[model samples]
Target: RTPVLQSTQGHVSNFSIPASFNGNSLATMEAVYVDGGNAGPQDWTSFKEFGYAFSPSYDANEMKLTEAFFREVRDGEVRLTFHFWSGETVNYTIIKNGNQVTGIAA
Candidate 1:
């Protein structure tokens, strides 16, 4: 069981997945960046994959995505999901195009 947590607050905002340290008690996390397609979870194509885990102290801010990846997603669909290795979901975040998709809409 892996979650899709610990992101740019759940969104990739210009293709940023944050970062994490290794050789620690903290759970591991992986980021999945989607290009476009179904607009649903497990729905987009793997535009690119960038993440950090138990190996070295990786800086979250230093983590970044491809420049072209942003160009392709612009004016298109972009979905962000996380894969956890703790066999449990770290948490959940609902994001809508660089914005916090409040539980409801007007």
Candidate 2:
């Protein structure tokens, strides 16, 4: 029932979701990820970016940049989290087999 949304139809190796904070106002979403393991509680509040780089992509609509493309070269596990301006946060774990996304847990 919130403004946060998840989509995986066309996205292959990334998590591109629709996000909004405090109703349709402009806001920012920060994300961090850890490979081969889960991001800890301390990592959740940090603003550090991931080793793999992907410029935050935002939609023209009021939604924040919600596209996170993974560039890891191996089949591994990734735990990611997004923090929004309205204190809303979402976490997900992605399973990768080679270059394709195999599974996702929210």
Candidate 3:
């Protein structure tokens, strides 16, 4: 499934879900990345090099989520998600209002 950008002047600072799935903690998650340029994985310009402020600490069975923040630098409605490595993705519809951000599962 692809993530669609709701606004050109938008930002995603964090994500949230239940602490566990099935009967295990949701720590198998490896990495998370965001982009707005609509570039493919082969393209060197796909995801921004210095555009995200990601801070996550995940051990085999432990974790702490700081926040993975990024803003839309370009204007488009065809944004996509490239972190489809391990677990299934949780696509969200990010809503940016003033300084607060909220996400609705898409």
Candidate 4:
């Protein structure tokens, strides 16, 4: 059974779930199309402009920053790995007496 915690907003947050688990499931979550056909390892580069030249709606949200891992498989098998820094930030706000409060006031 999963235990729950009450948040400041009176919402229950599930907490009984195990923090870590293991699995051996094979799945394809996403796929992308590229102009170049399947080819051996290669290097490529591209550039983009800043400011008005770029789209205003472009935003990236990363929750964890900096991680690395490795994997090994037997013959006739495949191994894949991904590593990157998760750039995430928090914008906090407080509410008191039915009014929104800012850090400056606290």
Ranking by lDDT: 2, 1, 3, 4
Steric clashes per prediction: 3, 0, 0, 2
lDDT of each: 0.33, 0.40, 0.30, 0.16
Ranking according to TM-score, highest score first: 2, 3, 1, 4
Q: TM-score for every candidate vs. truth?
A: 0.33, 0.46, 0.34, 0.14
User: Which window of ten consecutive residues has the lowest lDDT sum in model 1?
Assistant: 97-106
Point out the worst 10-residue segment of candidate 3 by lDDT.
Answer: 57-66
Error of 2 at 47 (Å): 5.0
Give candidate 4's TM-score.
0.14
- Candidate 2: tens digits of C-alpha lDDT, residues 3-89: 544533223444343434334322333333453332322344434343233223345322222234444223455555555454456
Q: Compute the lDDT for candidate 2.
A: 0.40
The best candidate in terms of lDDT: 2
Residue pairs that clash (backbone atoms under 3 angstroms), model 1: 2-84, 3-82, 4-82
**Local accuracy of candidate 4 as per-residue lDDT tens digits, 1-106:** 2111111221011111111112111111111112322111112211112221111111221111001100111112111111112221112111222121111110
- Give the lDDT of residue 36 in candidate 3: 37
In angstroms, how far off is 20's CA in candidate 1?
4.5
Model 2 per-residue lDDT at 47: 43
Off by over 4 Å in 3: 1-52, 57-84
**Better candidate by TM-score, 2 or 3:** 2
Number of the top-ranking candidate, with TM-score as the measure = 2
